[PDB]
């Protein structure tokens, strides 16, 4: 599963999960997708390379399995092509 996508950065998160800090971005391709990382800022037109992850988690209320898809970058890159 590989994704190569062009879009604009709509939101930036300095986050934390599983005892590891991460930086995430919202890519507004209008649909959107999250890019997770292990010069890019709000408003940038970027080209992203990385593994598409479905990242399924169980909802607390509905008890349903849902996708929370993201493009992982480690191989991967994020290139500002504005």
């Amino acid at each position: 599963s590989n994704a190569l996508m062009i879009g604009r950065i709509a939101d930036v998160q300095h986050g934390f999960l599983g005892a590891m800090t991460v930086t995430q971005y919202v890519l507004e391709v209008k649909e959107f997708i999250v890019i997770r990382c292990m010069q890019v800022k709000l408003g940038s037109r970027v080209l992203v390379q990385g593994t598409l992850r479905m990242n399924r988690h169980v909802d607390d209320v509905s008890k349903r399995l849902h996708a929370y898809p993201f493009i992982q970058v480690v191989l991967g890159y994020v290139k500002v092509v504005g």
Epitope: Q13, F16, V26, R36
Partner: nanobody, 127 residues
Framework: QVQLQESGGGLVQAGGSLRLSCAAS????????MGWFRQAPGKEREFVAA????????YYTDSVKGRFTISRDNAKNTVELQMNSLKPEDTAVYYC????????????????????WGQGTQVTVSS
């Protein structure tokens, strides 16, 4: 569109405990990470504790680790902060905040990335 309501604060003695609650109403469907923040009178607003939308990942500022516990219930749209072993240094106005960043499991650990803020509830610790 979104209203945040803090409750449960007030006055306590050193070593004592309080439980702060934050109820969220309006379009809560756009809320993800929830966090507690504080402002001592005269200083910058600072991160205390935060929790992800699914409640699987939590984060704490170093000086409240082992004393403070954050939790949430998504059916009631509330985030809670159990404050134990309180110190004079913890005296501040406490705010609950919400982030719009659409993520399930990742907790937002940066103050300026939070979008929604409540009016605040005063917490005073004396010896």
């Amino acid at each position: 569109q979104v209203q945040l309501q803090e409750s449960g604060g007030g006055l306590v003695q050193a070593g004592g405990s309080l439980r702060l609650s934050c109820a969220a109403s309006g379009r809560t469907s756009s809320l993800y990470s929830m966090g507690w923040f504080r402002q001592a009178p005269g200083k910058e607003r600072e991160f205390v504790a935060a929790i992800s939308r699914n409640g699987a990942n939590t984060y704490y500022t170093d000086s409240v680790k082992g004393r403070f516990t954050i939790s949430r219930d998504n059916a009631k749209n509330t985030v809670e902060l159990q404050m134990n072993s309180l110190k004079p240094e913890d005296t501040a106005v406490y705010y609950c905040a919400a982030d719009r960043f659409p993520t399930m499991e990742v907790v937002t650990i940066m103050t300026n990335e939070y979008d929604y803020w409540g009016q605040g509830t005063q917490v005073t610790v004396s010896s």
